[PDB]
Amino acid sequence: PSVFLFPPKPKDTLMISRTPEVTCVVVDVSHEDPEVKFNWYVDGVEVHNAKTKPREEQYNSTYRVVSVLTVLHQDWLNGKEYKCKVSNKALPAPIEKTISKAKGQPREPQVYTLPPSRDELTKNQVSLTCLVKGFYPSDIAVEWESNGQPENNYKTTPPVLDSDGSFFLYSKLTVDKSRWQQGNVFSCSVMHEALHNHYTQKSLSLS
């Protein structure tokens, strides 16, 4: 069997109303010796407020078991390490893995929206672009909207490391050209720790 430790989702750590969670995911657990334990430490100290989830069988004979610790927003955002221990009869010894947020001074994203290229405007569907650059660390969340209604048809590139050590990404929202034509306003929402109130938005309209 193996181990894989994972961080909160960015959106989760940035809005106080949401519940950010770290999660140990153990793979290639077998029927024989099926009992898997966990233990959790935050900055090494044992913490007890965690919750192992009930298990699941995989096709390939082997299980996929998963524990979950809830986390404080400021704790994660201040670099505390989240260590997860895992035990099992088919071990050499107790596995262990660790995670924490990237080190470094947070850097604020600059957010630009770009209209469709002339060349694409004539087509049935046009592409609205949102360029987010200069941000550190790479934990970020992007969303689109019009009229305070969530647009659903957009995709966002992963963050890419730029030449100066910050990250950028693009988000592409595709809309039927008419909406673009009618003059509707579209907005790109960006969530990031270095932003005032973890959040900014930029609008895109036909001029």
Ligand X SMILES: *[C@H]1O[C@H](CO[C@@H]2O[C@@H](C)[C@@H](O)[C@@H](O)[C@@H]2O)[C@@H](O[C@@H]2O[C@H](CO)[C@@H](O[C@@H]3O[C@H](CO[C@H]4O[C@H](CO)[C@@H](O)[C@H](O)[C@@H]4O[C@@H]4O[C@H](CO)[C@@H](O)[C@H](O)[C@H]4NC(C)=O)[C@@H](O)[C@H](O[C@H]4O[C@H](CO)[C@@H](O)[C@H](O)[C@@H]4O[C@@H]4O[C@H](CO)[C@@H](O)[C@H](O)[C@H]4NC(C)=O)[C@@H]3O)[C@H](O)[C@H]2NC(C)=O)[C@H](O)[C@H]1NC(C)=O
Ligand Y SMILES: *[C@@H]1O[C@H](CO[C@@H]2O[C@@H](C)[C@@H](O)[C@@H](O)[C@@H]2O)[C@@H](O[C@@H]2O[C@H](CO)[C@@H](O[C@@H]3O[C@H](CO[C@H]4O[C@H](CO)[C@@H](O)[C@H](O)[C@@H]4O[C@@H]4O[C@H](CO)[C@@H](O)[C@H](O)[C@H]4NC(C)=O)[C@@H](O)[C@H](O[C@H]4O[C@H](CO)[C@@H](O)[C@H](O)[C@@H]4O[C@@H]4O[C@H](CO)[C@@H](O)[C@H](O)[C@H]4NC(C)=O)[C@@H]3O)[C@H](O)[C@H]2NC(C)=O)[C@H](O)[C@H]1NC(C)=O
- In sequence order, which residues have a C-beta less than 8 Å from that of residue 149 and are 6 or more positions away? none
- Our finding on whether 100 is near ligand X (CB under 6 A) is no
CA dihedral 68, 69, 74, 80 (to 10 degrees): -100
- Our finding on whether 157 is near ligand X (CB under 6 A) is no
- Our finding on whether 28 is near ligand X (CB under 6 A) is yes
Which x/- pattern over 68-107 shows residues binding a second copy (rule: CB under 8 A)? ----------------------------------------
Could you tell which of ligand Y, ligand X, a second copy, none binds residue 178, using a CB distance below 5 to 8 A set by kind?
Answer: none
Neighbours of 37 (CB within 10 A): 12
- Our finding on whether 4 is near ligand X (CB under 6 A) is yes
Residue 19 or 153 with smaller CB distance to a second copy: 153
Q: Which of 10, 12, 13, 23 binds ligand Y (CB under 6 A)?
A: 23
User: What tokens appear for 43 in the block?
Assistant: 């900055």
At its nearest, how many Å lie between ligand X and the CB of residue 113? 27
Cα separations in angstroms, 22 against 19, 94, 151: 10, 19, 28
How many distinct helices (H) and strands (E) make up the chain? 4, 17
The residue length of the chain stands at 207
Residue 23 or 166 with smaller CB distance to ligand Y: 23
Number of residues near a second copy (by CB under 8 A): 27
- Our finding on whether 60 is near ligand X (CB under 6 A) is yes
Residue 58 or 157 with smaller CB distance to a second copy: 157
User: What tokens appear for 13 in the block?
Assistant: 């750590």
Reported in sequence order, the residue ranges of the chain that DSSP labels E, i.e. its strands, are 2-6, 21-29, 36-42, 45-46, 50-52, 63-70, 82-88, 95-99, 110-114, 125-135, 141-146, 149-150, 154-156, 160-161, 167-176, 186-191, 199-204
Q: Which of 127, 184, 200, 201 binds a second copy (CB under 8 A)?
A: 127
- Our finding on whether 158 is near a second copy (CB under 8 A) is yes
Residues in touch with ligand Y (CB under 6 A): 2, 4, 6, 23, 25, 27-28, 58-60, 62, 64
